[PDB]
Amino acid sequence: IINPDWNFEKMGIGGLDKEFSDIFRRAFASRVFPPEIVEQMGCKHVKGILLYGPPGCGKTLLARQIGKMLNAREPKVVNGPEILNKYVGESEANIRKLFADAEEEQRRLGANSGLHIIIFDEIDAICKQRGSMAGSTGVHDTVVNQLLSKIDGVEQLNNILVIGMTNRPDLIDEALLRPGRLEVKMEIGLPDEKGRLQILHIHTARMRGHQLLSADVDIKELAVETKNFSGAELEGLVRAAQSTAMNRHIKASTKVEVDMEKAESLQVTRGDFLASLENDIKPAFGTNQEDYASYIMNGIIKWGDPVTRVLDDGELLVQQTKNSDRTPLVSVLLEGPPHSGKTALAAKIAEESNFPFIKICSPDKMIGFSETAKCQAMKKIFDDAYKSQLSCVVVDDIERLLDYVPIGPRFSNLVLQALLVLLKKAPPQGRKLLIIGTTSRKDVLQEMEMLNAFSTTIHVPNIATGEQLLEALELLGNFKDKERTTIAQQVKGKKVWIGIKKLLMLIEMSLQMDPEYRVRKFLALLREEGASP
Amino acid sequence: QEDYASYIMNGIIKWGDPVTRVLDDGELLVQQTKNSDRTPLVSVLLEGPPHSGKTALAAKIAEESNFPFIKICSPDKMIGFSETAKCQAMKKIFDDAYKSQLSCVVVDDIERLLDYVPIGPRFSN
Ligand SMILES: Nc1ncnc2c1ncn2[C@@H]1O[C@H](COP(=O)(O)OP(=O)(O)OP(=O)(O)O)[C@@H](O)[C@H]1O
Ligand SMILES: Nc1ncnc2c1ncn2[C@@H]1O[C@H](COP(=O)(O)OP(=O)(O)OP(=O)(O)O)[C@@H](O)[C@H]1O
Ligand SMILES: Nc1ncnc2c1ncn2[C@@H]1O[C@H](COP(=O)(O)OP(=O)(O)O)[C@@H](O)[C@H]1O
């Protein structure tokens, strides 16, 4: 019913052109050959397939087009969580209601009926395997059995086709993949440069049709600027550009009584696209420039040699992880005394890598969580990281993730075991990863056998000389000439062990008085904090 | 034949005598478990310092046996599980192993299945 090489273009789906060929070659070879030879051989057709991948990557379009191209009746869409009810023996009824028409048509027309396709969604919701993990989601296992009894069993159905869709391929019941049942898996991953270009081509044909779009805008620049968008973020970008351009044009024309010549024109230009891209759309699988300003609040100032050493070592590690074989997983750990400024340096090192996927997992967003929820969140972040060619994950505080208190001692063992397992699991073939730690108590970590898993260590020291303090003050720029002179005469005493954060706090506290008494207050504050190595 | 090529990532090069001794001992154990009649159940434990290459050698010994049933139970596929889930998984694997006439099972990183930590000590009973 379809031409030998088929056709998939300018009909919607544009990014996935090899997938159709792959699936048709692997599964649907029986429905294209002349029926006489198929009946002569005496073979049965495949009775379903499974699709899995990241959300919003164009799965429903594929199912609808596959159904359309086979000359099948209207698909009977359905959702996963919708088929669930607390009353005993009611979900089975919902599962059973779906096949009535197929049964009736088979009963009437015999062996000449058409093809009916049922499209499920979030099929992993009904499965007696999610109960293994922490929680209670037994979903009254019986449900699944009923479904199987309809795909096969004593009563045979020969005019159906089941297309399953899922996001978590590791929660699918194992009994649902043997031969004779859903038995063809496939992956629909993120698009690439060509896919993004094609999607932008398809989604913008309307404006070009009526010459409304300006000649300034390109499509290659927007195709290369967007790194890990899938499909919906591109549609969102187009829509946001439309809306922003419209609002700006109407407001500007109201502000200035422009002639009808430009009033009729409603060009969107390129500025609207860039503004919407940089302010409107926030990708889920890409870099997030907003969170960096939340950690590096006062920038980075060079008060000594160690900063350059740390930055250079970070660059070397990034280069090693980027282009290298035989070692696709690399780890590192930053250790130092409290208030030394470790989080900011880690964030800077991650930012300078220019990787497409950068994330930060910190306990600031896990207040009141039970340990199981923390394990879930960590696993989710790492699972998301595993779906990109180059990634980078930062773990903010390893001591707070364990709930360590010196009395006892006390802590949670589940999180420790999860971290130890996750630190030594390479990604699927052909993909890289990088992990950066941070902590202030190295001895406890060494004592817990966790330092045997990391690959390197770096040291972040404090300010340990007077001239360094003078240089830091000079860079900050808060004291005058005579003030600096007075400070210099009195701080040559040596044995000066302070942290950058504490230094900032002391300066801020001291600057709350009149200019006369600032110096003595600052010196008193420094002396009360003047411990020794 | 996909797990074995996933656990032996860079082959097995012979840098000294011990490799030959280990492989020969494994072969002798396999032949014993195959040809005996009054000793159907056999066990062996491989131990050594960290980062020494125990899993690769165990996988190679299992693969070079030609048994019709072979399976590996590693802890890296049970992240976030509870004690009961681990018990059920292990029992299921062994129950499946019991239905063949010749089988081999690999248990990997025994110290990570019990959740051992030197402080305490703490673990799962
Ligand atoms: N070279 C630098 N190194 C570190 N911090 C710097 C540097 N230059 C400026 N800072 C400032 O230091 C502060 C970092 O303090 P922050 O509280 O992030 O430290 P931390 O090591 O993460 O602390 P904690 O041990 O509480 O987690 C930021 O204000 C940053 O602007
Ligand atoms: N003769 C050999 N013995 C062991 N490993 C070898 C040998 N020849 C090469 N290798 C390489 O050694 C690596 C195996 O190390 P592996 O990570 O399995 O160590 P391990 O002892 O299982 O570690 P762990 O105790 O951390 O679980 C693989 O790269 C393998 O290619
Ligand atoms: N080439 C394309 N690939 C993927 N999605 C596309 C493509 N062109 C358009 N889209 C849009 O992306 C969305 C993908 O289908 P949708 O049902 O929203 O997501 P999913 O089924 O992946 O959860 C739809 O809005 C669809 O119109």
Per DSSP, the residues of A414-461 read: HHHHHHHHHTT-PPSTT--EEEE--BS-HHHHHHTT-TTT----EE--
Asked whether the CA dihedral A468, A470, A475, A478 is positive or negative, the reply is: positive
Element (H, E) at A429: none
Contacts of A413 in chain B (CB under 8 A): 115, 117, 122
Q: Which residue has 């699944």 as its token pair?
A: A144
**How far does the centroid of ligand 3 lie from the alpha carbon of residue A187, in Å?**
15
Kindly report the nearest CA distance between residue A374 and chain B, in angstroms: 10
Contact present, A487 and A519 (Cβ < 8 Å)? yes
* Sequence letter at residue A62: L
- Burial (CB < 10 A; 0-12, 13-18, 19+), residue B105, is middle
Q: Which residue has 């990570």 as its token pair?
A: B112
Residue B18 is encoded by which pair of tokens?
């011990």
Resolution in A: 3.8
Half-sphere exposure of A502 (CA within 13 A, CB side): 17
Residue A389 is encoded by which pair of tokens?
């060619």
A137 and chain B: CB distance < 8 Å anywhere? no
**How far does the centroid of ligand 2 lie from the alpha carbon of residue A28, in Å?**
43
* Sequence letter at residue B24: D
Closest by alpha carbon to A44, among A148, A208, A156? A156
Answer yes or no: do B80 and A375 touch at CB < 8 A: yes
Give the rounded distance of the alpha carbon of A220 from its chain centre.
25
What is chain A's percent helix, strand, coil content, to nearest 5? Answer: 45, 10, 45
Residue A229 is encoded by which pair of tokens?
């968008």
Residue A455 is encoded by which pair of tokens?
């690959």
- Rounded CA gap, B44 and B58, in Å? 10
Residues 6+ apart with CB under 8 A from B102: B34, B67, B68, B69
Q: Per-residue DSSP letters for A26-46?
A: HT-STTTS-HHHHHHHT----
B88 and chain A: CB distance < 8 Å anywhere? yes
Q: Ligand 2 within 6 A of B20 CB?
A: no
Give the rounded distance of the alpha carbon of A173 from its chain centre.
26
Here the contacts of A152-157 (C-beta below 8 Å, separation 24 or greater) are A152/A180, A152/A181, A157/A99, A157/A102, A157/A103, A157/A106
- Rounded CA gap, A259 and B8, in Å? 75
B13 and chain A: CB distance < 8 Å anywhere? no
Angle at alpha carbon of residue A389, lines to A383 and A394, rounded to 5° = 55
